[PDB]
Symmetry: D2
Subunit: 309 residues, 4 copies
């Protein structure tokens, strides 16, 4: 089973920091995409087209596409597993948006959760995912507003609000919140469920993200959000058969538009300060290779390589 | 309250790796001590003297002294809090060994848990700790044997064996094991206690340390043991008043005599390969300063500074 | 806070047995109502009227009215607390059905959950509850079908099916099921939540009701269902301030139309075999007084007193 | 596995009430033994002999002997399973006391826990239990003092004190207390372990026995202690293969020397008021048969039958 946790820290003075874990089995690489880029939602099906208003830094698995990123307006979008997802009922003839590019679409076109949601609520397109793939999304902007987007029984389901700070895997959000409610009756200092189960991670992330210091000093908030992410990670290679362990973590400082990243296998936290990056149309695509064991450190803009994408 | 966790990974082909967390409130610095060094157990009381047979790499708090280290025979000694500790009854007239130097004594004089224990069982000296300080020790050698040493009601208490892989804070070891036994009846895949409580950390460390992959590849075992340590860390600045959060982690590869170290505040894992270090009598004391926010990376022998100690 | 648990045992060969606890602070008495009785839903408001098709045995609190009973078709209806209940929005002009008589209405007019539900789905009337009162209902017939009826934000909410065997207090049913789902992932033999909390009782009742022997021998099923009810009772006078402890239990054998009853304060289980009771229109109302400490035993039809109601 | 729970309620004004559950698979019957009776500890081995100073009411299984009772000084003795029990090492040549009569010996000869313990501390005899049987005992007198007696690795182990109010099955008492300590850190209103496991029952009994009302009114204390016993009972026929479910409960009012008893299979609580019983030497042995499904109620002295024992 897969395991991913996402948690938004809401601090003082617009300090908004989003942490995310990726647990699989992932072949992740990082890409910088200048704005004004030209994209289509599908390669076979009838789609929708767009040219990207905002540049973005994103992470992508080989077979998953864009699954995490921040755009230059500091909007963060994250695609996490939700096995019961059902994107449409049989006979859906809308334009198709590939599950692998859905995240990019969001990061390319929206600066605000409010606009992301207003657009998605039109239901212009449907999400298309190949059979032999089931994911929900969480989006948060720099005001700290968040939307959780799920497809259940072919129907669109959205929760929007600052209070929706955590997301994990199953069950569907409405139910996940009830499980969290139950555990809050118990009290996080008395007992927390300590397992790698989707709902246990939700409860711990939700408890700790609200317990870390209310600070606006990124030197504190970032490593704090990171220690929460570490608490809800799945210890490495955990088999006890094929349990999904944490491979990487990311933390997006959405105030200062900085994107931190660490690998469970590689020693250090590195990052990409988006304020030091050229997102102008002609700047050209760049890439941080991670699949070759590369070991980055500190600011990694320097280590960006050019890519013909 | 304080919080520290320690866990020994026992792998194939003598792969022995010891992880340790330090949670406080710590002013830790790291020191390399050449062998043949000359030391006394106390500065006021009648003591015992020794000259160190083995060199060692150790970590020390300002007001605590040596609280963690590995010697060149790959023996690891760790001093963790145990609030109910009582070192002697009133009227104890033995030579006094300072609590702040007890760990060093062990690392200086022993290559094997077997010899450490045989010596301590003589009860030649008593442990002396100032009033306004309560600690137990765990020792493990490169054969993966471990001893847990506690003082309860002024009496020496030792558990020796490979199976004693985990240690935390209260209660006393015999009782800690019973709590762990209870939680194993429940099953770590079904439920784990997920709190920062001393016994919860014990149960999770004990479960995960046995669940990570049985490998002899340090490139795997080390980061694995580290992810266990991260699971039992206390998220940063956790207040919910004055709860003790993880400040640093250490991991001792006792097969390859390498000593890894990370700070919850500083980005990266660094280390000191003891095979690249001169422990010969005249080599002179060296130090890694950590109290000034220093940010180390990879091998940090290069960054060692000379120290007049 | 109040606490009530209800659980339906589904056995072989139409063995259907419903257990129910009543925890309060209750002044309960038991009444036998011949059929063809004439009733109105309210004493002040515009209501609906009916004459009862089926006789029934019911329990009633002084200030609550009919809160539990079985009718001669073996249909069982139970009113349990649900604090978030909201029966209508402001400006509701429908005929009003008193919360105190809602249960009786159900028992008087329906032999089958299917018909109860079909009628309620018309939403002809609204439920009226005085301010300074919040309850949901569960109904099950002799085929073992069950409906759970709740009013949330003034809207009617129903779950119908044999699988809906348990009901407790908050949260709303959809969410209660999610909490139960979570605890089933954990496994009832590994861990059960053991508290008097509404959701803990749900989880234990749900686990045990499915674990007791599949038998059609009432000599076994009844005492079994009773031992489940005893497991989810709240120990007496539990204060640790004003916690609601179990005062009585009831168990309805819906196959043999027998109604068992015990008081936490009084030694024995007694019952009323509905097959030995005259429900014909002229038979007249009868009553088992419980508020005077009466101690009944075995068959208590003999102890029935006449009542001018 | 077997399951038994025992819990002592300590109330105001010498109100001392001991509850006990019996879970097996039991063929229990109840016996009244006049004092001045003549008994030997074994039928084959070299034993010890005595003539009973106090009369007693006791319960006995077919193949277990005396496993629960109260004597006329209101002293209560209970034999519960402890699988790790080891009564002696090989080569023990002391007089042998049959495990089946050990309890009777205690009830026959002691009025006070203080004297029971002082005698047992001599270790005059050893406990003898046939191979193809492992039990610990708890004793409490009318001052509310209690002793827990266990044999571990052939050694006698005793805990004596008013605070030792609860006993269950494994692990050994010292360890059982640690598990209970852990769960008290968590808090019984926040979470209780709700399983039929030996330690879960200990924790719930220990929590609730201290939470029920502090009263000296037996009309309250007795049914209260009973509701605690019901909470830690094992629901009937629980299989989910061969799990041991509660068959009977007993409650000993040690202030008023009354002995209450109920069967999970039989409707009512009955009792034997020892103040209405003739324990004088010539009175003759009497018996309450329970193995034939007998259904008793209220005072059952009347139902006592004579027995040639």
């Amino acid at each position: 089973s897969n395991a991913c946790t996402r948690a938004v820290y809401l601090g003082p003075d617009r300090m908004v920091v989003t942490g995310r874990t990726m647990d699989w089995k992932i072949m992740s690489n990082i890409y910088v995409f200048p704005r004004g880029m030209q994209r289509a939602g599908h390669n076979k099906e009838k789609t929708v087209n767009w040219t990207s208003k905002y540049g973005s830094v994103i992470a992508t698995g080989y077979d998953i596409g864009t699954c995490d990123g921040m755009n230059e307006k500091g909007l963060v979008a994250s695609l996490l597993f939700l096995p019961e997802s059902v994107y449409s009922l049989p006979g859906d003839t809308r334009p198709a948006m590939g599950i692998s590019i859905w995240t990019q679409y969001v990061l390319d076109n929206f600066a605000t959760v409010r606009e992301a949601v207003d657009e998605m609520k039109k239901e212009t397109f449907r999400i298309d995912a190949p059979r032999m793939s089931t994911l929900h999304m969480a989006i948060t902007d720099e005001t700290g507003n968040t939307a959780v987007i799920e497809y259940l029984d072919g129907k669109l389901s959205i929760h929007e609000g600052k209070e929706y700070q955590v997301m994990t895997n199953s069950p569907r959000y409405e139910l996940q919140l009830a499980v969290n409610d139950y555990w809050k009756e118990v009290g996080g200092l008395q007992m927390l469920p300590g397992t790698n189960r989707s709902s246990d991670r939700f409860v711990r992330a939700s408890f700790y993200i609200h317990a870390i210091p209310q600070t606006a000093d990124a030197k504190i908030a970032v490593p704090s959000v990171l220690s929460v992410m570490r608490n809800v990670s799945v210890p490495f290679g955990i088999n006890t058969p094929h349990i999904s362990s944490t491979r990487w973590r990311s933390v997006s400082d959405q105030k200062n538009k900085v994107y931190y990243f660490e690998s469970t296998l590689t020693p250090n936290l590195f990052w990409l300060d988006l304020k030091k990056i050229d997102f102008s149309p002609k700047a050209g695509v760049k890439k941080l290779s991670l699949t070759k064991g590369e070991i980055y450190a500190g600011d990694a803009v320097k280590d960006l390589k050019d890519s013909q994408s």
